[PDB]
Write a protein that binds this ligand. Structure first.
Ligand SMILES: O=C(CO)[C@H](O)[C@H](O)[C@H](O)CO
Ligand SMILES: O=C(CO)[C@H](O)[C@H](O)[C@H](O)CO
Ligand SMILES: O=C(CO)[C@H](O)[C@H](O)[C@H](O)CO
Ligand SMILES: O=C(CO)[C@H](O)[C@H](O)[C@H](O)CO
Ligand SMILES: [Mg+2]
Ligand SMILES: [Mg+2]
Ligand SMILES: [Mg+2]
Ligand SMILES: [Mg+2]
Ligand code: NA
Ligand code: NA
Lengths: 289, 295, 289, 296
């Protein structure tokens, strides 16, 4: 169980300086893992990353969100093939890094669709995801589909939909990824989805309802962490937060970050690392006696 | 018999129908009273072709009050930098205010300060100035007709202007119009706000309209919204404006609104049970909170 | 799944009039069932009750809390036998009434112990409770041990303790009774006790944190009812509230009811009926579509 | 090392550490309280006559730690008794406790000081209440001249029959009208009696001068039913900057009288070093987090 921080706490540009900065600041805030947003994995400086991770003795993972030009839920096979080629490059980036986990909105575009998912689009997604999963299987990489809210996909809005999606592909390294931010909008409660997906849950995002400081919003973290403890979850737990103060050219506009929710990210990250770790410590004590 | 007091318990029309032709108006007015509500809220996405006579007739027959909400779009975006786009929306808003006056309604609300969509760029100072100026004109027009206007705070995916009650407060202070007020929504508050009582307390004076929605917009009490704290806080400020249920499912589709609001999922089929559940939920909540000042 | 009301919403005296009064009002507020507090089962008017239940078509159950003089968790076997004979008469009363459910603090005194439990006292309790369960069994009655808080017993304060207690007795009609008012104090959360006790959960009390109006205190009813949804619970669900305005000379003092929490019980009972039936109506829709 | 300067002291109650406050327990508890990160230790002055003040003074200076004391009366000392002998025994127990604090150079005295801390079997009587009010009014006056604040702790129905809610406590103060007399709320007891976790804070605003952070069952924080989020948010909205003191009880750490009085029947923790550090970190992190809310 590694405790991680999403790279957009620190920078929005993952050039050499941004890779080095984020890795270092992640280590300084107390985390074990940095999660690299590979929005563009074709231009991600793997050498700078492997060097920075080794220096700070830190682990890496990667998340990603596709767009209109790379939508695998598209009925246009050229667009589905673009996304599958991007997803495959990211898996390659993770293999080069020696990392084990790939996750995110890799089953559709990460946007506000204006129509429902189509049956054919869903097949294209499932086929695509299955091929990525198989390719990732030979390289030692787990793939987790992130359930996100109605405004960021029209495909996987609940843990149950994710479970049905997986059940068709029945790939041994393909898992579900839950984000407390997204749960707090779409799910019926913060404990049933964790119980429901028990075996399939392989990646977790910790995010406040407005995506700022932990425990300054509407997200029921207590119920969540107690559920996680009950199914014996031992995957990554990764802080995630977005503010006007750290902008990415792509991601910040896709996630609708219009507001300043922090300025001092070194305080935000240290606090969050403390928040998650002490949540896990308290829950262990329900477990025993 | 019409309920004459100010705190009316209302239903959003989209529990009942997506189409507000004459049958849709009649179906929703009837089903709304059959559920126990005092008021129906009409989604005037198009107020130019809204059958005002049918609405008058059905409201009188069933003895029901009405209000109207609305969300703009790209062609009607008042936060657009182009005075032609701005003035298209401004004509849209004006017709809605007129439709309400004909109905004898009091309350106009919704996302009327920008398009109701997923923006890709933060707001501009120029568009912000356009929204304020136009909203200031619509409020003026409404004031002569005995209509209040309430700006609905909604989540980051539905506007890039007013995402918190604090932003709305600041927006009103600039315009300083006596009939312009704030409209909060528990669904939206559950995303953007810090907690469910601070928005109520900060907004106290300006809170004129409230929407009751579960976190996923389904059945009340099957999601993650903290209704207890919200209602307790409403009772602490002695709120007595409208309180209106709001729910969307793929069962009942609007060609426009269902797609703008991202209703991909089926959350209920039986809307008679939904509306009846929600009426009791709101009214029993209000009944319980009243007992707290005594114990 | 009958939805019940505790008798002290209506009266503190279960003489002929009290019995008739409590049965009438329970039905007028909309309940299916009235739970009689059998503080003194020897003097309970069974005939008036059977009369009143049939007149208003209402089901019945009974609850009870032992006192110092009847403490089956005593080391004094004369006290233990007084307690056993009182429990036995209560079981008898339920048989005559034609009821199925007996519940309450029947494994110890209901009081503020000034000493931890003794091993000798714990063994007295289990053996007495076992005999009452055996007796009850031949009359088709379930016996449900109510988990209460640290101030009302020193024996069974959590569902986990109740399960371990049951494990040693292995009686087929012995179950656990949970009260939200008590869980809100002693339990780690409102779902995990339900899931842990699912087999043996046979009776439920619905009470606010201060025992007044439902939804005017600190109890997490949402998580509670959703957990009951998860395990398929369909035993009795009974409203329980206490106020200065309805006094039971014994029970009001034992429970520490010092405050006015309601003056008009007719509104209170109607509200609590709607509240519970509406929680259940909504939870049913979570399960499927 | 160095004494925390300001008023908002993050403290720890002594029964996290030990149940006996002879010289050894005082030293043990002060050292561990500083070790876990706290600014303050609250001594349970159940018996203030036999309290070793000079040892206390030593340990507090050595470890750079502030102090306060809490206390709960009993049958023999019930200042809400109608027997004036019993009220006097209480008033003289309270007075010595006042005195120990002044010797320590403390500022805060709190606890269940308006009655016995027990499960009463009868409602409060008008005569007892009269005794309680006048007697507390005197202990407050006496404490006033010494620079001591006196905070009445609101506790649940099973531990008193006088002050079970914030509103009751207000009406008690309004009748005494004493400047140094204040209210002490406890999230554990609030979780039972109050209407919610923010109204008692908003209602008590002025007179709120002491705060106990205890979980619903009184073990680790964040492993129970207490709504800490709303509570700390409400603290932030009123600008509260008094003490904030952790409080936990487990059968691993037993005081002869107190642990029985409070019904500590269960084992809720054993490694109290980790508990205190966890609790300290919990409170400071909560207060950090909530200070961000005004800005956003
Ligand atoms: O929470 C998320 C978006 O709503 C996901 O983690 C994103 O896919 C991630 O930020 C991409 O790097
Ligand atoms: O909640 C809303 C949309 O998110 C607003 O109330 C809309 O304006 C409404 O649904 C349209 O009538
Ligand atoms: O909750 C209870 C006592 O605290 C139980 O319901 C009692 O056994 C009941 O009130 C007595 O009939
Ligand atoms: O919370 C308390 C009891 O529940 C009070 O603080 C006690 O009186 C305290 O432990 C006595 O020192
Ligand atoms: Mg995420
Ligand atoms: Mg709304
Ligand atoms: Mg009970
Ligand atoms: Mg305390
Ligand atoms: Na929430
Ligand atoms: Na609670």
């Amino acid at each position: 169980m590694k405790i991680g921080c999403h790279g957009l706490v620190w920078t929005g540009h993952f050039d050499a300086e941004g890779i080095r900065y984020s890795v270092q600041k992640t280590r300084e805030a107390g985390f074990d893992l940095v999660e690299f947003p590979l929005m563009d994995p074709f231009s991600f400086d793997v050498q700078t990353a492997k060097s920075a991770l080794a220096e700070h003795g830190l682990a890496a993972s990667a998340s990603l969100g596709l767009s209109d030009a790379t939508d695998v839920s598209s009925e246009d096979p050229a667009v589905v093939k673009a996304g599958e080629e991007l997803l495959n490059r990211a898996v390659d980036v993770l293999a080069e890094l020696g990392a084990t986990d790939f996750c995110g909105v890799i089953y559709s575009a990460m946007k506000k669709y204006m129509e429902p998912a189509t049956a054919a689009g869903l097949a294209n997604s499932k086929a695509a995801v299955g091929r990525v999963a198989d390719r990732a299987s030979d390289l030692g990489i787990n793939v987790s589909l992130e359930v996100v809210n109605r405004y960021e996909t029209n495909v996987l809005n609940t843990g149950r939909q994710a479970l049905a999606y997986l059940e068709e592909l029945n790939r041994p390294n393909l898992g579900i990824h839950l984000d407390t931010y997204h749960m707090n909008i779409e799910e019926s409660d913060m404990f049933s989805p964790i119980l429901d997906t028990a075996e399939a849950l392989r990646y977790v995002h910790i995010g406040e309802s407005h995506r700022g400081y932990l425990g300054t919003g509407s997200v029921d973290f207590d119920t969540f962490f107690k559920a996680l403890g009950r199914i014996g979850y031992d995957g990554p737990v990764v802080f995630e937060s977005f503010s006007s103060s750290v902008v990415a050219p792509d991601l910040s506009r896709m996630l609708g970050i219009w507001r300043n929710l922090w300025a001092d990210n070194e305080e935000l990250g240290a606090h969050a690392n403390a928040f998650i770790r002490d949540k896990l410590t308290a829950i262990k004590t329900i477990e025993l006696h």
